[PDB]
Amino acid sequence: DPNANPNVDPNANPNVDPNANPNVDPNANPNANPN
């Protein structure tokens, strides 16, 4: 939408978020990193 309202919005809940998977995520490159 070319006429959406821009910029960064205030009015949010900036108090971390206690609703997320607290477990280890088994989905990452398991290989050594050559970089």
Epitope: P2, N3, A4, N5, P6, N7, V8
Partner: antibody
């Protein structure tokens, strides 16, 4: 809010030229930016907008495909990349900070612009 | 030119003159807020009017706006020589891939 513009000058047609708008007095990363241009003898034509995080890139059809808008939040700088410039692209280019009231956008502050001349 | 504007307006210092802007169902009657800019001759077209009637602290209390349907308007009272400028209205064209549209621009000449 302070907007400073440069990069104008005369360039042969078919060549590129790029402009920049340096900003200060506010957090650059919290606002989107606009480029607009005014050909000598004409009114003001809107050119492009980029959102604060690069998430939106809108162009007037008259400039789309030749003009690219970009920004670098670590430099507080807005850039306009112009490719294959036409004589018709001669204009004072201006940056402005994005703003809106309820239903439409607007510029809430303007830089002074710089002149890009495209000529044989 | 997207928004319709007369090419010219004028009056003597001290007088009230007005600038009109007219649109359609795609850009004024459309519900898009119509704003005004003042292109003083040596600079950028700074914001003059916003919110159809309101204005920046950078604007003399001479200026005010108005909007009803497709009819947008700018009044300049107590006209000064320093008000010579190209005035533009601004809105958003429902069929525009870009974000802003401007009217043709009205040139205000102060007769004194």
């Amino acid at each position: 809010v302070q907007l400073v513009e440069s990069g104008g000058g005369v360039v042969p047609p078919g060549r590129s030229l790029r402009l920049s708008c340096a900003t200060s007095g506010f957090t650059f990363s919290n606002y989107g930016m606009h480029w607009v241009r005014q050909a000598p003898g004409k009114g003001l034509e809107w050119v492009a907008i980029i959102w604060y995080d690069g998430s939106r890139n809108f162009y007037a059809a008259s400039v789309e495909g030749r003009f690219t808008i970009s920004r670098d939040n670590s430099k507080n700088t807005l850039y306009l990349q112009m490719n294959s410039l036409r004589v018709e692209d001669t204009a004072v280019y201006y940056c402005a900070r994005a703003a809106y009231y309820d239903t439409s956008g607007y510029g809430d502050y303007w830089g002074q612009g710089t002149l890009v001349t495209v000529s044989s | 030119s997207v928004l319709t504007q007369p090419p010219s307006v004028s009056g003597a210092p001290g007088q009230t003159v007005t600038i009109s802007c007219t649109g359609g169902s795609s850009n004024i009657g459309a519900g898009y807020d119509v704003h005004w800019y003042q292109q003083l001759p040596g600079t950028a077209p700074k914001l003059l009017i916003y919110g159809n009637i309101n204005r920046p602290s950078g604007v003399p209390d001479r200026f005010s706006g108005s909007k009803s349907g497709t009819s947008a308007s700018l009044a300049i009272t107590g006209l000064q020589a320093e008000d010579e400028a190209d005035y533009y209205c601004q809105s958003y064209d429902r069929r525009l891939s870009g974000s802003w549209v401007f009217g043709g621009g009205t040139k205000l000449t102060v007769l004194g």
